[PDB]
Point group: D3
Chain length 235, copies 6
Amino acid sequence: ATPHNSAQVGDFAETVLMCGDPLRAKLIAETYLENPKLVNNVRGIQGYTGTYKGKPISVMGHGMGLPSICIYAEELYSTYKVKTIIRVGTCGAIDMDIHTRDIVIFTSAGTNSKINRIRFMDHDYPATASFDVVCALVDAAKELNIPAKVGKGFSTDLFYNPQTELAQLMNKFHFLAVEMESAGLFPIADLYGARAGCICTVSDHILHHEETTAEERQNSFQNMMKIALEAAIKL
Amino acid sequence: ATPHNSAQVGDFAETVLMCGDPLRAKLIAETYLENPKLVNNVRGIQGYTGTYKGKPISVMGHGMGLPSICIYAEELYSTYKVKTIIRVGTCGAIDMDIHTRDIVIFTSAGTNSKINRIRFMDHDYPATASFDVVCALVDAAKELNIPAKVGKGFSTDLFYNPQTELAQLMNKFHFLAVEMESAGLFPIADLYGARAGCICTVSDHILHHEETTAEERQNSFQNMMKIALEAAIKL
Amino acid sequence: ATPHNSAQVGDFAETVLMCGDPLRAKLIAETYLENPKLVNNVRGIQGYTGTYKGKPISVMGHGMGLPSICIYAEELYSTYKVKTIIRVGTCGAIDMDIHTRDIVIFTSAGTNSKINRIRFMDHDYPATASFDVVCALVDAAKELNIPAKVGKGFSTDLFYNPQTELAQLMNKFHFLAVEMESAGLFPIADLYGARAGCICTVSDHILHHEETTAEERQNSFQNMMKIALEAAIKL
Amino acid sequence: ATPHNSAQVGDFAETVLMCGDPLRAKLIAETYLENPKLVNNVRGIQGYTGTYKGKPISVMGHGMGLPSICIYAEELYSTYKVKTIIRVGTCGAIDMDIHTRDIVIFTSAGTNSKINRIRFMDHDYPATASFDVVCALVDAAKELNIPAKVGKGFSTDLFYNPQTELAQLMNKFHFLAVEMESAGLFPIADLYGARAGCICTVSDHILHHEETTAEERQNSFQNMMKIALEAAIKL
Amino acid sequence: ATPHNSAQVGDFAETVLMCGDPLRAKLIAETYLENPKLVNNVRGIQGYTGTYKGKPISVMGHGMGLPSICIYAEELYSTYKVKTIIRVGTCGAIDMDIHTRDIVIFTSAGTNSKINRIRFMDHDYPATASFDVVCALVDAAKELNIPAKVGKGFSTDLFYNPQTELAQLMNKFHFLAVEMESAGLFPIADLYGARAGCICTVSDHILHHEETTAEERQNSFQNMMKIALEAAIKL
Amino acid sequence: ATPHNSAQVGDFAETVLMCGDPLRAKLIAETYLENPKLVNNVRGIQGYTGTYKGKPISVMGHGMGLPSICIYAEELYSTYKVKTIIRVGTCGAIDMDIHTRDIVIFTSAGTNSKINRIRFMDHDYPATASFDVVCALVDAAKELNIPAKVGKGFSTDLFYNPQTELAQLMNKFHFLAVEMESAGLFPIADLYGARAGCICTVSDHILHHEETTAEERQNSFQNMMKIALEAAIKL
């Protein structure tokens, strides 16, 4: 149907969970969905559609960086009539009070990208997570009683960032974590009158060395997944 | 104590309601607070401190525009140790589905200002309302059962905006309303590890002529005030 | 007549003196004008119209920051057909050769704001004081024989400026003082084919501790006021 | 060895061919290399190392967009000590004199991204292909006698570009094609004192409908691959 | 003494008149100065030093564009200890009320250049003519009773400007004329604690066809020269 | 024919060599061309047209800075129907591996100017030398067997650059040399479907003191000239 998707309108559920790693997306599909069917694998993106608690749900990769997720999100909202895209994955902690293996719910995401300035007449567009999605993620967290931190995230274009001072600046303004897609996703959802959200488990800290026990990193991941899945049902 | 405030540390409650109109702030103090005492009137700003349901509460004006509210907010968070600043006032609707006299709860605010870019190494800072404050405002709305719209707002530096195309662009991205302070307030709260939020009643629509009945504009205002006050207690 | 002014066309003199402090404006009206009448008090702005040496003159506050004064200036030039707006007030010295209590006449004002870039296709607009007004202010200074310094001013959006290096940069380029309105005012006057100017008394120095004797600060203020008033007559 | 690569120093050849599609990279490895061995598949990136005419050569995917390829390129140049990265893939034609199925050799790439401005003190960095690589690609083209167009390319962050006027502007300045990685790749090669280049086959035209015969699109692809491979040997 | 000047400290008068055309500068030297001596001709710049009414005066070309005059001005203020640089030349009218052959005195100059933003931490620097020089030029005009227009000028980097809408924008803000050096000159004078000014005769109008009689264009030029010369003496 | 050129269509050869120094251009004309005739001297620019090996060739100065060369290049390509403009001159070395008296062939040029951003919708335009011209210059170098370095150049607007850190940044990215015209020239050639190139001899190093023997600086210059001339014939 599109340059980056072979599936046809209807193959995708109206709620799609997206992560960077296509293998992760394949794992998710095989681990949490019932009767997952590969509906799209253009560029080995691993797009699946199965069910969770009787409801239709799709999981697909979105590469890394805003330019990438921007392609998938717009194609999904526009061509496949998707209504909700919840980004699920890992990220790097910034704030000193955030520890590795912590789950973070993005209220919004800042960015060093130029995309939003391009779509917003060079002004400051607040890449804000859909309020419904934020509430669904937080309610899920509360109901499952899984500690989660809610706040600003930051979508960087430079994983290896030359501006090393930026990190401390972000810690001063209390940015919770860093990833590479949210700031691009959120505004595209607004444009299509659709919804977007993001939940991540901190896989590493950028300001100091952390303690990462083998079974603690997985628990954290599974916990984030439960929240994302339950919230999807609520939506 | 400061160049723009004569009050001393302790004169202000830890939760402060701020609007642009100092006369409005005086009205609010005399109408909703018990035993309101004028603690600061430098520049006729009308800063009061009284009580609501037994709890300490302060109401003060903040002029118009980010540069203005930036002065008051930082002085309050820094010198008077205020913890929460809820901006309460009027605004101009953008989105076609938003009508005059509607109450809007800001999740965040975009801006055509350069301030946040100055404090954020020229990148995109997401002026986001403190999540606690957004939730307190929405819960108050729900509990009082007062219809309110939650979403992005826009803080403009140009009330009379030369870029007339911006309005339609904002309607396409579904910005709810336009005011002139939120985008400045939110990031200053983050810096001080404090909290900020904004709730406004739409006094006019920028894309078309609206119907404004005399008693409907006041009800709307009183309703917004109830929500702001109750939320303050919850915080 | 406007959203921020209740007065009608004709209530304002064609020459208006504006300062940030509305109480200051009230003081000015009661101290230097004959038969001052409050023609507008929307937002406690304290707008008066009286006479000086038989001629009509208006004094009104304009809040703090470019976004604020931008609203009043354009409304005045456009709706009330005002011809001259002279900003009168305080400011912070930059240049080492400028001392507290010194009177400064702005030839122009730089800014860290984005407004002029918005109205000027993102190029460098030189916020220049109307040449007639500069000459009227300087002639008044010379005739009254009151020492005044003439040069560049700087209108900041950040009273509390994160970019602490900016101050020394400005001292190197010899910016005389810092305030928060001129850069916005000047270009709006040009747009309306009208005139604008600014004169300030330095109330404090930003690069070092100064000596401020009680009666020296008032004399300085009264002197600045005489110059502003006489120049108004000349215009 | 890295967050996005499991291979160790030595697993990668000093010359690496990179395309967006990981499946394409797998195809390339199985079709043109002898004894290709999968040395890295983190994120299903499909990184292989085999031989071409007795020489070591690696082929791996790089996702879509500058942020993505920026991660891989820097990791490869820095950790795996790679010397040459030749981007090989598809692109969209701009210039009217460029037709679908045409092969284009990038001399350089423009971009609407902010990355290079971030690494270059906000000035204009000319994302230029390593001269050795450009010459190797052009010599290969000449020796194989395969018609190829040499000129500027454009790396966009927005596949779906809101600024629809940009296309005609680029046609006026004769930008040959559009892709999404070159502008990020080239400067990273310079930083590491290494080399980078890009060759693409136009899979579609952005200014008008083109004729794409089944066997013409493959020939074009195979031809581009021959040039890329032979040039690699020359390097 | 410098890369662009062979003269030594002392060869140049403390007041230097500069125009773009080196031949014009040679003409000026031979026509208005007594005993003009060529003190520098690096790059055929035609730098002379002679006398006017017994006082030392130098005339030299400065090429075209800010980058050019920036080199000469800084070298002159820094190495040759020059105190005043008055730019004298031609320009293109913008404002409809400005006619060909009109003399214009710059109060300041706007620009589409990035230089001042580079030297001013990316903020708005008001390229303002030294107030002493503006007054000297205007007094000379008044004393000689030669009609002159005083106001903003604009220094463009693009004589052939792609942004054709800019012209009308400038006419709306009443920019008097367009040249290519003032915006660069003025800030360099400030940096060296020295002085700069600019006076031009409009040789053509950019918004419509004008009437240019043979002897009217010369008179205008001679008149501008008298003003520049007399003002130099006053300084 | 134009404001800066008195010559008529046909007076200029289709290939024009341009340097900053008009005296240098005069020298070149008298030293390397047969029967050189001065076809244009507006502003003492020294524009000549003679022959080299029987072929028509023109040499003319272009002042200093992008704004300057932009005027000449566009007038030449547009009015005089010139096809190739090869900038020939001096420059300042950046990279530590570049020594004084070294000849450098620009593949492209970066810049701190705003021109290209103005003509390119505020995006990154890669000021790239025409590939034909680069190849002609390099072939000439190879055939004459004159060592030349090929790579990025940088066209600065600030000969005296306040941003002293830029130099080291450029050395890290391996910018070969610095001049003041290429970045402006290259894009104008693209616009006119014409060609441009640049070759310079390093007259000084910006990062350290160099050894410059009298006869080594001239040899270097003559060598650069041979390459430029021979390449012109090849084109």
